[PDB]
Amino acid sequence: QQTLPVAEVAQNLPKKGYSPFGTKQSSVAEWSLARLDDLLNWGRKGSIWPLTFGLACCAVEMMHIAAPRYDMDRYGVVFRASPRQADVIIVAGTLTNKMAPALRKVYDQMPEPRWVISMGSCANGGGYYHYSYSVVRGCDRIIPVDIYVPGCPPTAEALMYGVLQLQKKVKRMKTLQMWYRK
Amino acid sequence: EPKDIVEVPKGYVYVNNKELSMEFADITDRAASTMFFGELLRGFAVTLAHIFKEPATINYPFEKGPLSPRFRGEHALRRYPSGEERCIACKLCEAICPAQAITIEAEERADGSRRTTRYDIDMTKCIYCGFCQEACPVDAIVEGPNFEFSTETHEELLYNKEKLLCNGDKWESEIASNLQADHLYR
Amino acid sequence: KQDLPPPGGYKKIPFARVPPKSYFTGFTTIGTYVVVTAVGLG
Amino acid sequence: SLAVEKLLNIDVPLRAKYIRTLFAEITRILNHIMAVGTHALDVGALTPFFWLFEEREKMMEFYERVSGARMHAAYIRPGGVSLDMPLGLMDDIYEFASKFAERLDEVEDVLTTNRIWVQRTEDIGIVTAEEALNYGFSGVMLRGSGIKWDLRKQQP
Amino acid sequence: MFYMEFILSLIGSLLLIICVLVSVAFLTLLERKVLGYIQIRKGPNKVGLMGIPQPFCDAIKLFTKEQTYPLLSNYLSYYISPIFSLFLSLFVWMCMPFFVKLYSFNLGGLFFLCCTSLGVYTVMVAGWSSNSNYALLGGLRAVAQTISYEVSLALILLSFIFLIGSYNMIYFFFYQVYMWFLIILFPMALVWVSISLAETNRTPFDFAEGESELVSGFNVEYSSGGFALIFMAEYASILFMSMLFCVIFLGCDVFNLLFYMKLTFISFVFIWVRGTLPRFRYDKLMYLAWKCFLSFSLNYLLFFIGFKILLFSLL
Amino acid sequence: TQGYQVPPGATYTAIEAPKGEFGVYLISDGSSRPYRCKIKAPGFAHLAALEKIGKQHMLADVVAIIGTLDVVFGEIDR
Amino acid sequence: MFSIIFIALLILLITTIVMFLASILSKKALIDREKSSPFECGFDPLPFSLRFFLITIIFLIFDVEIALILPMIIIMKYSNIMIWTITSIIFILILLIGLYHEWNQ
Amino acid sequence: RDAFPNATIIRPADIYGSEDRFLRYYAHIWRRQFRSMPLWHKGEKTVKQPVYVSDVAQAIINAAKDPDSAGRIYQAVGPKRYQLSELVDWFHRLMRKDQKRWGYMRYDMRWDPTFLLKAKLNSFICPGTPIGGLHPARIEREAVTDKVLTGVPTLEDLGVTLTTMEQQVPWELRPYRAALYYDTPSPPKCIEARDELRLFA
């Protein structure tokens, strides 16, 4: 790892700023595309709409970020039932062999950009039914997954930590800078 | 007080057992509640009274919710105060692991110790059940307090021996405090 | 010490259904509506 | 645990019996909060879902204190319970159970005797006594129709 | 004919459209905020400062996502429903009572009934062109409830026009100079709230566009800008129903700031019934729209026929 | 390491779940592992009458019926 | 009315321009077989209903009936009072008797 | 081949499939001009031998595994030769464009400078990829016929069974079919060697 910086060292460090790219771009067109990508990523991270895809027990914790203690609504996060209106699909439960074409069709009808959160050990790696005859060995064999939330029923702080990690990934998305360098 | 349709016994309680009242005062009361939305007015007032209540939103991550000293989180491998690793490769944790996440391969070290050459826990397979820390004769494997360990990539949740030893080095104070405050319960 | 109830026991935990206070009466509601609309017509 | 203990002929102590009874009743309230919230979300009233899931999160905090997990406690074992109760757990359970009845009354003030909830829940899916007896119904589906069968009293 | 009348009418109408659209965005913010406060939970926060640019976070996201289609070959009929929906929601506002003259609508109630009668048309083309059985079911259910309370709404507003003696909306101001019509028309106030939550799809009448019995009624295949235009059109319909409640029952008070405070309060009431009530059924809603509200409409229309004849002899 | 030796035999216990009657038909062969553990879920028998209850009802009626059946499909699918 | 045509055409033009710029601003990805599919929940996939058609017909009959209730607010100060009252009471009373008869049968 | 001597050079002719630049390019609205497709010499002069993407992927893997394919050029072409007019007419028969109310018409491209002006403006105004791939390089690529070289190996020497066109292409163009007007398709005619020599004479 790295040691987290001591406050004597960290007082000499300057402020990071909001932009992961920095304001030190050379060209004015590159700087304008950087700020446009910053505004676009702020709009995308300011409201991600996850889809009501609750397969198994993990989803009982998924409603617990809907719950008044954790309150996902002040993070841009609000559930949508239709897959067209939703940004994120949260695979929260056990993907089985009869569940595989349904999950693939629901993911394919979702419009791009598409970030996928694997909630729980049945969602990533198979988990407690990994050696079962009718359980897919994780959802990574079917749906491409950006965030993997570890706990068997993830606490709801850990699922919301996965949500904040997805927001940091969305804030780190480089589209217009790649277009300028394509 | 309406009469009972079914006589209620001693050990039971009956719902929707009241007779519908037929005197004119109760009929006018039910009629006014139907016409002028009195029960809907009570529902609206009860709803509006919860705006003035305190919000229970705990403002993550500046303020985090309550936990317990028994809490099951990231598995981690502890060490002795002298510095030697605690895990004697005795393999009760892998025998008791119900999802069979733990893989142990052991060889004799140069000084003759039993300590492991491979200790892998598949955290995508681990169900965080805590059977390994109960089945550990020494206090080697332990459930750490950490649960903010979501990964970008599937392979990064395949925990090696070095990752578990680094988790034991990083989280030693809180794990030792929980084990000091929890060992007499177990 | 073990996890035990205090001496004298706990207090009585409420479980019954208490209704909210209903100020209105149906004859009173109908009569007040009639009086209010009779003033309003004038 | 009762299956394995009846196979093993093992009698649990009385404190384990009382702990399992109290956590089975806490579990019963958690299940019926989930049932009422899911039914109210399916009917349409989305407010008692959150109003009762705050209370559900308080009992999941109680499960977390007693076992270390918010759910799937792995706490009841064949032969009793896995761990002893922590000190001061009942001093929170009593305060919580004293506070729960007002939240119950606040849920019935918006769900019970609201005419839309009655229109979505009255004379709908009528199950007779011979229907529930012949079709293998159990629990509330027996006791909605009038059968007095509760397994906590008939076979304690 | 004097050209500054055309210039100022154009400027006032465009300013009305712009302010209605920004008030739609802040109404979505208000609904997400106080609808959270209906329960214990908080509203939006943590975006910008105190959650204020959250609808702009919605608008940047919805105008960037991939415009997907319910079929790949021909999808121009998919486009024409949010265009006409937002056009009607921004076009219905021209019959607002403006005291400084913008449009001299001597028949404003008929204009409102016309735009409400097109609401069925935009939701019918929303349902059919989305190529799904859920979409057709939601479109048929929305057309059913909106034409079921169209007749009731026409009779209720027709009973209200008997009070002012004409169809001019500004004539609601002169007959409210001593008291509001909330005092005289309180069962009509409850019936008009039940009407205004039926033409615009809200939670008490939500079998058309709910997330329980259908996943979505006619927004099921609409996304990435079409859903944004549909959402803005529906919240503009909510704002129009709040204004039209505040003109008829509460005193028109167009200039006073208390009129717009009451308009925000009736929007608060619309979000207050959003969180409270459950959803009606198809059979119970056919019972409500064609028997109870129709019988009340005809009966209390007879009451105002008798009352306007009785005052005509006395005056 | 290896579980406690349960004597060989069959039993069926059943308690009052909040859903209904939760039953375990546990049959042991004398080893450290169970030979058979059949689970009676009450939601399976509650869901088996949905075909007769749901006929001649409306769509919101059926939505309220699964809303009031108190089914959880983890134990139904076992 | 001529200003209403101009402002309605301007609202239509502004909404079509906003949707065209939204279609330009929408992120263009590779089109797919399954993405264009109509959404049925999960696994991939109505006849004429007479009850809804008679609902539309009842709506039409009552709409044309309301279109004769509409003028009489203006006519009340410019007509014979006895004739106006007889026609209004007879009109709404026959409507109420027909509604109650169709309810009972 | 000057830098890496043992480099395998697979030469595809024109690769068809899903999300391609052949069937999607002939499937787009921006390629057509008032329900009529311009083609160079009406599509009759050019003969194309297209290959599937799974066949060339299997050829790439069979070249990577077998080490006798070092520095050998492999002509990646399909099983049978087709001319472009019959291919485009077969595609429009698959998309149900053969109905008389649609107004399908095939005409000469060299008489139409408006189509090339549209292609140049489409290459100009698009910031990223042009819509439908209507850059003039694709125009010259569809103008150039597919010529195989004798004595240079074909993918059947790499041990892959080439999928025929009529099995795969109706599955690709099944979502591309038009809505039926309110008022099985014939397979296309292959071009042999002697018919191609008669056509090019």
Ligand code: SF4
């Ligand atoms: S990962 Fe654990 S909590 Fe989640 S669905 Fe699987 S068993 Fe249930």
Ligand code: SF4
């Ligand atoms: S039970 Fe403990 S000491 Fe034994 S092998 Fe496992 S971690 Fe090591």
Ligand code: SF4
């Ligand atoms: S907590 Fe349970 S699943 Fe995880 S390593 Fe320990 S025994 Fe295995």
